[PDB]
Ligand binder design. Structure first.
Ligand SMILES: [Cl-]
Ligand SMILES: [Cl-]
Ligand SMILES: [Cl-]
Ligand SMILES: [K+]
Ligand SMILES: [K+]
Ligand SMILES: [K+]
Ligand SMILES: [K+]
Ligand SMILES: [K+]
Ligand code: NA
Ligand SMILES: [Zn+2]
Ligand SMILES: [Zn+2]
Lengths: 347, 389, 128, 347, 392, 128
């Protein structure tokens, strides 16, 4: 009934290795790589932001859908780094893809789950017949606090999904969705401050794992499924460790979770993390493959999805750049140039 | 001056307990201790609580009133005793002296700590050091004990491998402990290659920040037979305490804890036994080196030789058994409860309780000793238990 | 931060406990019933936010954070179900008196500086 | 098939008259009152913010819906003044009404249209059958720049709407919805800045009226209607003058537009403006009444709604406070106390 | 179970002591107590210290090790005991029980507090309340006791004038005390018209923030004879303690302190005397109302009548037919260094019963030779009572 | 804040005390001589900032404030006069060893956040 008709991704070209950050701050890089299961992260060009990344991903999704953007009836951008405090990214993206003016739009906020929240909104609008196609994007240019452990994982990227009703155009089908949400102060940022604050070890078991695992078990109960019913999986990935712990807890093997894990070479792109991992799965998946996708946001909340791939997948994969190709087209930079680009130098 | 005994012991799991509140913890320990001792709530005549953190973890002082209130035991007198990481043992000793005095017959001695609620625990654990002349200049609590390890290595030639074996043993022992924070085996290489906190110590040498609570029911030796079988009663032969300089730099010798020598010697005298008669010992090994030093100061081996006797791992039938539960590093170090837990382990070991069934030490003589240390050595409290009165 | 999360359902929704054994409602929720102790069996219980002023005071020189509120009314409210709570009252200082019926309200209680977490909870409003 | 099962509103008790602001800045108050068609505005207590206002409105909507909040499958809060930069208001609201944990949520941003964006999202999820009930909130504690003209109108308030599928439970029915969106830099705020910036007279014809009138014309064309088919109307109301100009341009009379206009005594509550105006219409409307509701947000976009009132309305209106009762329970303050409350004094 | 006595008492001045450091303070009190008791440093077998703030004022925990170290008495055991404003009395009771046990013969019980070093003392004093359910909501410590006064006024009809008379007496008595923080006369109007802190309380009803230290030397009743003459030895007939709910809202009746009734009754029972035999009493009057309530809870008058007693001045030294309360000026006038107050309370009874020259100008009449002290932690969650006599 | 002011002469100038009775120099200054206690009579004494490393450690993960310094050397210096102090050493990680001669230096030790006071005091520097 409801499915993905097209999807697209974008990652900028600059990277920075853990070695380059630790060198400056006087830490052991090998300990960090092993502790976090992270090697390097992405860095946006100083002329790039969430809007531009969202546009790249949106335009790529249109190529794969093969539709006329004028037909898109809603555009939703989920982010933590909207270029304005008050001016919608989503409007800029619609204008940049030619979707304007006959559509609704909104900018979404819910930590790193903002991106997947928009998918559920589009599913509703398409399923109810209120629109013909909807676009949900998740994109971020995350910034980690200098000297803090989040600086090793805070990266830039995004992915877009177009939702539709036409079986001939669906590359994947939603079987069901479920969400787990509570009020959890694991991670936050106040309006004045430059970088967020967090509860350290509270971000784990009572927040990420509580919500990611409750969302996963919940949708499997709703769907009457077990881990074995699924071919691939993707969880939120603030670091490699959390991802693998969650995946192994639920009974997934490496073959099932490998494609969804991008953080070790991409970093944590926040609201683009699961959207990007999902896209890498779709670049590899075959007809009939069944996917479990579960996001997480501090706040807190998780969005779970149960998706089945169709035969159309192989018609569209090459209609836009593949997430792995984007991830490997890279130029390395050191910490000085990194903080210059990211605007981390006082003036 | 009455003889004092232990009739019950209760403990929560030690670790990162997010859901369990500070209140939920001390209750769970108190009810377990009450239930094991076969006493009613009304039978408690007084309580003695240890909690170093108090108002630095949560901002709550006056914890005694809070604990008595929420345990439902109002109007029983409740008192807080503080000596940093030695608060647990100090609460026990206070409880012991109150039974010996005749003013109370059945007294609960417990300790509780809620370290996970603070963002940064270092500032609290650093409270046990001199704030003006150690912390102020950037000497973190692990860095102080590391400087002890460096000086000990300088004087006695201890090698990092010898020190690291202490942690391998502890973790192996902790896999047999249900209440231990860490239940995984390790290796020498994993210990030595772990991330460093303060040279020469690594994360696998340092004890973690821990939530937990433990409680004992102490009772008059004669009335004890009223609640417990004569079989399951353990007698407190000695409860001693001593003092040393608060700052490490003011110590006469940094390789030994004079307060432990003073306290342990006094306990051995009162019990009229020698170190050779101890079957099980629980020592304060928050940073491993401290475990080695205490094994010497309690008289189990010569100064500077602890590294050599531990390398052989002295399963071993003819040597004292140290930290059967995993010690502070592996079992967990909830500051206020540690001193209580230490003794609760000796109680289990000497009464051959099911709880320590999988980690049961051989008991030829029927004696155990515990050494609880506050900070870098400024306070030491020793408890000597026996199966015989 | 973690402590607020543990008491959110009590501060937001006034959800306490009822001991089945003696029937007494407790708010804030209690782990143990003081009257039955071990024989007590506690159940979840939703309180109505309605109560009456039992006693009160007017805080004229509070800590700096409360500078916008100063002078504010602080009170102990006796809730209809039985328990008493300590909370501020959103009324003028010349309108508070013992016995005044009040009603709980979700309000911003505290904030941990400019960078830290905002803490919400109950404040009581008179009802006419 | 889709309708409103319950609604609720909240306004704080403090007000400030134009005279108290003009007195301080040396302006003629009568010229302002006549120019903007505004007499006074609302002011939140220093212990009040968007979250508390949203909870008040949500709780009132639950009373009118007469349902168990556990059944709510989505909570969306639209605002410009979320108390945190990164921590979702919607989660706090869900916890405060007992909707957690089996729900999704998101915080919405799109200037003053954020609130109505959530209504459309709830419409989609309910119509599609993905949830049984969804909640959409629009609330704000607006802050105008001291000395600027927006300080005369920037007020606090909010309203909540619960969307459902069951005719027996509907107090109003959605006949249709339509949205007009472009990229327009009429009003914005950058992450660092305390107060927004704007294009002055660019905010009028090319932005507000362009989008409001195209959206209003759009839904009437979609629905096959004329101004004569509607009993009541409500447009975005940054001041009284824009509202009335828009209403008269389309051909609505005073009797048609009078109820939706609250700004003259409430101020502009931004994402709560139209939700509150709509709620006053519902407090007065009778069975069969047809409403045209069109919101506006800068960036820019408008959301249009065509709604018909049902027989159930009289059953619920008194189940919670009426928007006029909230608006008229008030206490006046002077400028000194106002800037103290609003945190406008550098400290 | 040995009988315990007091052989020496020492005290610093209570007030804003900028010169004197926290370490420097406890020493001065310890040396004075050692000198008064005619003992050497080596004669001390153990120490028990009270301090509520500890890590809130200075960031320093483990004060026991610090105090023993800098007093020079290492390796004697030193122990910190805490119960908010009652830490002093608890330190004494711990010391008494350690002597009675036979493990120590001579023990120092002392308390110290350095409240001036913190920018805002409120947060520390609020520690004695429930942080999650009282402080969190903005109930300051003076506001809690003000809500007690309000309820007491509601039930028994106490008038603000009657409450204010407690403050007038306290300050008059404090002019006779060299160690008092405030040595000035006041009047009813000055008390009532002082700046308000928490309705109905005024700044002249509230005790101030104080630095200070005080120490006692307690000893086995029989051993006492070798250091002191049989005159000037005071015997501890009873050292009792009780608990109540930490939060005022959890109290069954907020107009009384059950833990004081429980503790005082137990003390009277052990000493085999009635309240009518008490010649001088030291009560915890950090906010005046607390002075009236304790006068009732200790049994000197019927509930609700404390106001009538204060107006007639029966608690005054000059008044002969009634017990004499807070001859030193109490917490309000003499000063309230949280950790040392419980020790100081007892030190005054020691001087009063031994007719020491320290209290010569404030000497109460001693018909029977008994004194009692009531030390309260917070709003009443902890109460410790000590009953002294000139007779063993 | 007040506690820094009291120890400024010790932290800035290393001014301790010498007990006449036994002659032992004490730093930090002590109110009472531990060996003579009462019979000790203390006099003001100016120490030279010279000493040797007695023991040391390298702090690899300190609190956030020290982020610029990390990893830093912490040591106990035995001063020529006798006393030992705890302080940081301005040297490279691979240059610290027991017995190295050092010399005190006036340095910025800590700062109480962005709004609070700056505290200065001694840090040790190697000789040649
Ligand atoms: Cl029981
Ligand atoms: Cl926006
Ligand atoms: Cl001496
Ligand atoms: K459908
Ligand atoms: K048993
Ligand atoms: K925002
Ligand atoms: K639900
Ligand atoms: K009374
Ligand atoms: Na009298
Ligand atoms: Zn019960
Ligand atoms: Zn000397």
């Amino acid at each position: 009934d409801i499915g993905i008709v097209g999807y697209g991704s974008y990652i900028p070209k600059y990277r920075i290795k853990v070695e380059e950050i630790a060198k400056v701050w006087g830490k052991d890089p090998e300990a960090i790589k092993k502790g976090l299961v992270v090697n390097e992260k992405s860095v946006p060009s100083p002329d790039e932001d969430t809007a531009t990344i969202a546009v790249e991903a949106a335009r790529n999704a249109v190529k794969r859908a093969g539709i006329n953007a004028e037909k898109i009836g809603a555009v939703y951008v989920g982010s933590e780094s909207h270029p304005y405090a008050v001016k919608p990214t989503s409007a800029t993206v619609a204008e940049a893809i030619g979707a304007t003016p006959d559509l609704t739009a909104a900018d979404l906020e819910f930590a790193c789950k903002a991106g997947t929240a928009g998918i559920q909104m589009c599913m509703g609008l398409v399923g109810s017949g209120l629109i013909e196609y909807g676009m949900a994007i998740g994109a971020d240019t995350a910034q980690g606090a200098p000297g803090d452990a989040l600086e090793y994982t805070a990266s830039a990227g995004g992915a877009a999904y177009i939702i539709g009703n036409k079986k001939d155009e669906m590359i994947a089908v939603f079987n069901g969705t479920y969400s787990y949400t509570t009020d959890t102060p694991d991670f936050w940022r106040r309006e004045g401050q430059s970088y967020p604050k967090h509860g350290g070890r509270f971000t784990g078991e009572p927040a990420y794992f509580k919500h990611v695992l409750n969302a996963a078990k919940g949708i499997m109960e709703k769907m009457g499924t077990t881990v074995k019913d699924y071919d691939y999986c993707v969880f939120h990935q603030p670091n490699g460790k959390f991802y693998i712990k969650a995946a192994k807890s639920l009974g997934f093997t490496n073959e099932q979770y490998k494609y969804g894990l991008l953080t070790p070479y991409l970093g944590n792109t926040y609201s683009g993390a699961v959207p990007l991992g999902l896209s890498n799965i779709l670049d590899h998946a075959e007809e009939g493959a069944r996917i479990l996708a579960v996001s997480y946001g501090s706040g807190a909340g998780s969005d779970a999805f149960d998706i089945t791939v169709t035969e159309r997948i192989k018609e569209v994969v090459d209609k836009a750049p593949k997430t792995l190709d984007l991830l490997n087209r890279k130029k390395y930079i050191d910490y000085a140039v990194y903080v210059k680009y990211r605007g981390k130098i006082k003036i | 001056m009455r003889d004092v005994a232990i009739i019950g012991y209760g403990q929560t799991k030690f670790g990162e307990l997010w859901e369990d509140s500070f209140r939920d913890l001390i209750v769970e320990a108190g009810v377990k201790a009450i239930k094991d001792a076969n006493v009613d709530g009304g039978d408690i005549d007084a309580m003695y609580i240890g909690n170093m953190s108090g108002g630095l973890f949560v901002g709550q002082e006056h914890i005694a009133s809070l604990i008595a209130d929420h345990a439902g035991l109002n109007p029983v007198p409740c008192t807080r005793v503080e000596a940093a990481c030695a608060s647990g043992s100090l609460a026990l000793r206070s409880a012991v002296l109150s039974v010996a005095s005749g003013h109370h017959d059945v007294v609960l001695a417990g300790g509780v700590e809620k370290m996970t609620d603070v963002e940064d625990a270092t500032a609290a654990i650093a409270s046990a050091s001199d704030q003006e002349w150690e912390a102020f200049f950037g000497a973190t609590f692990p860095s102080l004990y590391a400087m002890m390890a460096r000086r000990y290595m300088y004087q006695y030639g201890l090698t990092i491998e010898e020190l690291s074996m202490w942690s391998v043993i502890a973790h192996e022992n902790a896999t047999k402990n249900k209440y231990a924070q860490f239940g995984f085996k390790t290796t020498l290489e994993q210990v030595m290659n772990a991330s460093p906190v303060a040279d020469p110590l690594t994360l696998m040498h340092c004890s973690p920040v821990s939530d937990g609570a433990s409680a004992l029911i102490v009772c008059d030796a004669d009335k004890a037979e009223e609640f417990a079988p004569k079989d399951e009663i353990i007698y407190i032969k000695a409860s001693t305490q001593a003092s040393d300089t608060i700052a490490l730099h003011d110590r006469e010798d940094m390789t030994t804890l004079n307060a432990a020598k003073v306290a342990s010697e006094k306990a051995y005298k009162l019990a009229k036994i020698a170190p050779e008669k101890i079957d099980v010992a629980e020592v304060h090994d928050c940073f491993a080196i401290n475990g080695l030093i205490l094994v010497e100061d309690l008289g189990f081996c010569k100064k500077g030789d602890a590294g050599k006797v531990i390398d052989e791992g002295k399963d071993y039938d003819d040597f004292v058994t140290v930290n059967p539960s995993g010690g502070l590093k592996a079992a967990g170090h909830a500051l206020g409860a540690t001193g209580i837990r230490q003794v609760g382990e000796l109680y289990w070991q000497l009464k051959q309780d099911k709880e320590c069934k999988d980690r049961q030490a051989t008991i030829k003589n029927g004696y155990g000793i515990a050494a609880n240390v506050g900070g870098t050595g400024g306070t030491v409290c020793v408890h000597l238990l026996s199966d015989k009165r | 931060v973690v402590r607020s999360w543990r008491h959110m359902k009590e501060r937001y929704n006034l959800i306490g406990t009822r001991c089945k054994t003696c029937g007494k409602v407790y708010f804030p929720s209690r782990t143990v019933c003081p009257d039955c102790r071990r024989k007590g069996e506690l159940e979840e219980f939703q309180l109505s936010g309605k109560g009456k002023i039992y006693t009160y005071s007017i805080v004229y020189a509070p800590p700096k954070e409360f500078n916008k509120l100063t002078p504010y009314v602080i009170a102990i409210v006796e809730l209809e179900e039985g328990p008493k709570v300590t909370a501020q009252v959103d009324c003028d200082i010349n309108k508070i008196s013992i016995g005044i019926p009040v009603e709980a309200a979700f309000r911003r209680i505290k904030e941990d500086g400019k960078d830290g977490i905002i803490s919400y909870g109950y404040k009581f409003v008179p009802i006419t």
